[PDB]
């Protein structure tokens, strides 16, 4: 365990342990993210880093770290890392794909059903005591929500997570429309998902679920204009990234009935608070917990430990994001 | 439009109209259940009646009802009608089956997922501004919920709804197990469901969903004994009837920790208030909104009328609950 590695947050012990035997591990104890200052300090002698999607690994971080040769992102997304810069510096950047697919997929559908049926609102009605108080028990017109079975779901970004969401959608016998960068005949037939241009999908879909990474090409992909294309009774689910949606536009689309409601797990700024958004009833919110499942986090901690260790052994990491960096340097310390 | 029909509550316009040209309709207009007396008074010269769950239609009601010949229940469950006496008095009783099947199955899953993933508690942490306030964006051990995909779902009651819940589960690649009055080969194969002893189903399921009618046999089917039998990590979902569960035992099983959580749509008293339960964070509650979907309450409405409009024409109601009554008297007024 000669190599040094800093882990920016308390991850599953199963992972730390695995590293304890090949690396000299240091871990950030405090619950709240590591201060930007304190971070540029720790990375001084480290050879590898295990970062959260919260840390901004930009050039500054790279500069204040001469021995850093691999950064293991404890997440599947990496928009919080300066990939290109890292590749030029011969630095390997890994993420944790697959191991968290079902966790995220399950939550999307949780937000879809909950948002379409008023679970979160009804619960407040029952819990608070207002249900008892009002005296009425069961009314023919209360809490009317949207059907989900047999309806049309539109998946934007048919990758690992998106495909998972389509499988669950098959249980509900929904019609599956999807918009992604390419058409994968093999996937389409298997899940029976029909490709359609984003404008058609947002026009025909009863549920629109975002499963794309955050890129310059997906930034605010869902804007005011796009929201208008949507049915007044459609719902928008976002377990992707906050910035993929123009929050101001959404609040408007909601407050003005352009769409029925929205279920959000990700926000443009985290933690997040928005009085006008949070005031709505046809909105379901969750603190970025897409992957908050016992299995997912466990498998994430293991995958992270796998990459670094493979690296130590001069092996091409299992889940390397920037493969081009392979030619700019060799894996090792 | 000679026949007279009293409708206990305001239900979808589509129904009131279909009958409008076949019956002399009167619609109780208060959101709260009709008081005992007022109901007794109103049911004097009524030839038909449209009731809601909450309406306790016993012999006392049949007495003040000299012209009552049919009772259409705006619901699929009829544990609120003294069927025996109904038959004895030659009164036909119909319900609204199937039309609300998917609406209820959907919610069953809304609950299963929302309970398994702290959706209700997440929305609170986030919505109240408590998330921003705490200043921590994302932590590897926050809101860890239970995986669902690939897990075992045990369905108590494999009827129209319980089967709809199985299909839904196929979408999450769940291992389907069910306990029910009778094994149905045709259905088992189709859904790939395995019949199992109630005792086994409760020891092997990660999720237990109740979908049985309320009967002398099902009263408190789930009690302290059975609760204890469930996995310490299992979740109980009840969209059947409140009385099928021993509320007090569940509270304990939750606090004590015999099981992980419960999503309840129905209770022993409705409206319901229980300080002890309502203070648990591993319990998701909804005001008995199982069939509250536009299409459902809509279809249910057309069926009620459909049954009444066919009876008037001297025909056996499409969804007659008591077939035994066809003999005790023919169809008609
Ligand atoms: N809420 C949570 O806790 C949580 C958990 C996990 C992930 N996430 C977020 O959601 C994402 C899920 O991605 P994944 O794990 O499924 O990775 P993935 O398999 O790479 O999926 C990404 C999909 O988006 C497509 N895509 C990319 N840019 C696009 C564009 N401009 N227009 C249309 N489609 C585009 C990709 O197409 P190609 O095949 O051409 O690349 C691919 O189909 C993560 O990257 C992260 O941002 C959130
Ligand atoms: N929460 C809501 O808003 C909502 C909405 C609709 C319905 N519900 C509830 O759901 C119930 C069932 O609806 P459904 O359409 O599924 O009716 P169903 O199909 O007639 O009944 C479902 C199954 O329950 C089984 N069963 C009955 N007693 C049993 C017992 N003691 N042990 C094991 N299995 C038993 C029946 O067996 P058999 O095949 O032998 O009959 C049937 O297979 C309704 O009565 C109502 O209480 C709730």
What would you say about this model in short?
By secondary structure, chain A is α/β, with parallel strands linked by helices. Chain A has 15 helices and 12 strands. Chain A is globular, with a radius of gyration of 22 Å.
What does this entry look like structurally?
Chain A has 333 residues and is an alpha/beta fold. Chain A has 2 domains: 1-97 and 291-333, Rossmann fold, CATH 3.40.50.720; 98-290, 3-Layer(aba) Sandwich (Rossmann fold), CATH 3.40.50. Chain A contains 15 helices and 12 strands. A 7-stranded parallel beta sheet of chain A has the order 8-7-6-9-10-11-12, sandwiched between helices. A 5-stranded parallel beta sheet of chain A has the order 2-1-3-4-5. In chain A, helix 5 packs across helix 8. At the A-B interface, helix 5, helix 6, helix 7, helix 8 and helix 14 of A face helix 5, helix 6, helix 7, helix 8 and helix 14 of B. The site of one NADP nicotinamide-adenine-dinucleotide phosphate has 29 residues of chain A, from helix 8. One NADP nicotinamide-adenine-dinucleotide phosphate binds at residues 76-77, 97, 100, 104, 157-162, 180-182, 211-215, 217-218, 239-241, 265-266, 288, 290-291 of chain B. Chains A, B: GO terms for molecular function: glyoxylate reductase (NADH) activity; glyoxylate reductase (NADPH) activity; hydroxypyruvate reductase [NAD(P)H] activity; NAD binding. Chains A, B: It is found in: Cytoplasm.
